[PDB]
Amino acid sequence: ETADGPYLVIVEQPKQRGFRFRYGCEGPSHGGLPGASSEKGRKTYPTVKICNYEGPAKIEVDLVTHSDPPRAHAHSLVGKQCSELGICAVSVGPKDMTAQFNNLGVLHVTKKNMMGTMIQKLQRQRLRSRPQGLTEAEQRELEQEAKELKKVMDLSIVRLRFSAFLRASDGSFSLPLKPVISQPIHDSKSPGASNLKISRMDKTAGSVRGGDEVYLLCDKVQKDDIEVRFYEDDENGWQAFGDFSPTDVHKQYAIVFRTPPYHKMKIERPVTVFLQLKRKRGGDVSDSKQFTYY
Amino acid sequence: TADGPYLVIVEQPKQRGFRFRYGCEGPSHGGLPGASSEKGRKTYPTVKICNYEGPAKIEVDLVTHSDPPRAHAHSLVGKQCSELGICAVSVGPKDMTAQFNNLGVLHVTKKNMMGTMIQKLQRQRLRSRPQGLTEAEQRELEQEAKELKKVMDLSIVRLRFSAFLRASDGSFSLPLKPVISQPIHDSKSPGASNLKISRMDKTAGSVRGGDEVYLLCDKVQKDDIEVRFYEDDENGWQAFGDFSPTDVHKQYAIVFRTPPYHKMKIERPVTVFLQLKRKRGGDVSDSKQFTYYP
DNA sequence: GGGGGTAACCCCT
DNA sequence: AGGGGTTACCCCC
């Protein structure tokens, strides 16, 4: 890895949640895939660096599947750093060996397009390392992949693949490094697949007993995949949950839940705990609101 | 007017709750019912010929909401319907009433509207010397199409019943004056969804006071909705919920402050009604009860 | 038949 | 740029 030569490292991953993939018709300039630690105070973008080598290199980025045999995604990166359809590319000058990708879009392919767009991509890979032409059998078989790749491909999750290149024999940058794959990126427009947000809730306080019903208004969530985690910041690390049925999650924008019992029963003074929305599979949370026992 | 044979609508179509279908959804999702239809007792739009007995054939077709009845981009579909989107039932000499019991409304896409429009307009304008007329005036036919498309509501249609008697010279081309029904809103157009209240966090509050209530509702438009409190007639009293558009959360929840009752310091608590109402429409939801306490 | 939800698109500020 | 909402489509039971 780190002493089999020069290698890439992702200095700043893409933000896994909250980024919207755009269909070609929505427009060309709706805003860039940011870094995992971006915020409106200070913006960050996915960043990578070449280690163990200095001097000109070219880093390309392209979308691969969520699946770990990393395969090219039907979706395309779009933006300033990209070509006609040719993928996004940044140049590392020798002093600073790190590349920011600060204007990266994800063009959403329609299902009605997916196969055509994918054959059009597999061809290119066939005519990449391997020789110049495709026999009809060569092509019937390429179309195979397309069909059985469309059955199993998640159009709401992508991974960036950074492919770093160095000047080969002729000075043409076609001698590559091992490619480095980022953490998965969810489409904020896939239902309930954005980041958790607590808009407002109707009670801020209840009895230490628990069982008090609270109306929580949130951004779109999945009835089946959401929870309401109460907790304390301390060495005790106490946690409890909201009590609700799926029918209690109203049209993916509200949760009617009954508060959990506090870890003690006879508090002398009123105690503030935190609650947060949490994703069941994933573990990402919303910003916590305070709740006071007694 | 009893100055000839004439059509009368015995049973109008239901104004609200009927869904218009796009061609791709399917062909057989259920019939436009009568204004007084109900579960178990179904009615369908019905019309009758008066001042005449014997054979007629009645067509129905979709006209604009706009009072100069014009042909709508949408077409009637289903059991009784020819390719051309005009439906016909034949009225036998004994019973002079026609039920249309299996009527669909095929929703044209906006991308289809022009072609669908030029095509219904040509067919309309094709009687006299068709071959050389058509070409001469299709540029200035297309003028209507453009200026008809920007001003046509695809969420409201009217049935137009056109009755035709047997002209024994040829047959069945003899026209009666056409009768236009009351309007039919697409239940899937946001502006026409049936208003429902799911749940509410308080069911009582202080008479001549406004408390904050969380209301969970079906889809509403922030700018077109209200919360009407009302009684079984005492002084035909009504008051409203207090909330700004910001208070209508993702079209499925309303955070509002209850209005004061008309009569401060009531002897004991009084139950009033509350309901969602569209501002312009005048359609409302089934009312929930609210109790004013002193 | 009759729904409920997801996918693609539009357009405001 | 970044949204908020409508339009078109899918598919369950």
Author numbering:
A (entry chain A): 33 to 326
B (entry chain B): 34 to 327
Report text from the authors:
Mammalian NF-κB is assembled combinatorially from five subunits, p50/NF-κB1, p52/NF-κB2, RelA/p65, c-Rel, and RelB, into homo- and heterodimers which bind to specific DNA sequences, known as κB site or κB DNA. The DD alone mediates protein homo- and heterodimerization; the NTD and DD together are responsible for DNA binding; and the NLS region is flexible in solution and together with the DD forms the binding sites for the inhibitor of NF-κB (IκB) proteins. The mammalian NF-κB p52:p52 homodimer together with its cofactor Bcl3 activates transcription of κB sites with a central G/C base pair (bp), while it is inactive toward κB sites with a central A/T bp. The p50 and p52 subunits bind to a 5 bp half-site (5′-GGGNN-3′), while the RelA and c-Rel subunits prefer a 4 bp half-site (5′-NNCC-3′).
To test if the DNA and protein length variations induce structural changes in the complex, we set out to co-crystallizations of a shorter p52 protein (aa 1–327) with all three PSel-κB DNAs at various lengths. This short p52 protein only co-crystallized with a 13 bp PSel (mutant A/T-centric) DNA but not the (natural G/C-centric) or (−1/+1 swap) DNAs in any lengths. The conformation of this complex is nearly identical to p52-MHC-κB complex with minor groove width less than 4 Å at the central position. This crystal with short p52 is in a different crystal form compared to the three structures with the long p52, and it is also in a different crystal form compared to the MHC-κB DNA complex, suggesting that crystal packing is unlikely to be the main cause of the structural differences, and that both the DNA and protein lengths play significant roles. Therefore, we observed an influence of the length of the p52 protein on the conformation of the κB DNA and the organization of the p52:p52 dimer in the complex. The same Arg52 in the complex with the short 13 bp PSel (mutant A/T-centric) or the MHC-κB DNA only hydrogen bonds with the O6 group, but not the N7, of G at ±3. In addition, Ser61 also makes direct contact with A at ±6 and ±7 positions; these contacts are not possible for the short p52 (aa 1–327) co-crystallized with 13 bp κB DNAs such as MHC and PSel (mutant A/T-centric)-κB. p52 monomer II makes contact with only three G(s) from position −3 to −5 (right). Interestingly, all other NF-κB-DNA complexes, including the short p52:p52 homodimer bound to both 13 bp MHC-κB and PSel (mutant A/T-centric)-κB DNAs, exhibit more backbone contacts by Gln284 and Gln254. The short p52 protein (aa 1–327) failed to interact with Bcl3, partly due to the lack of the GRR.
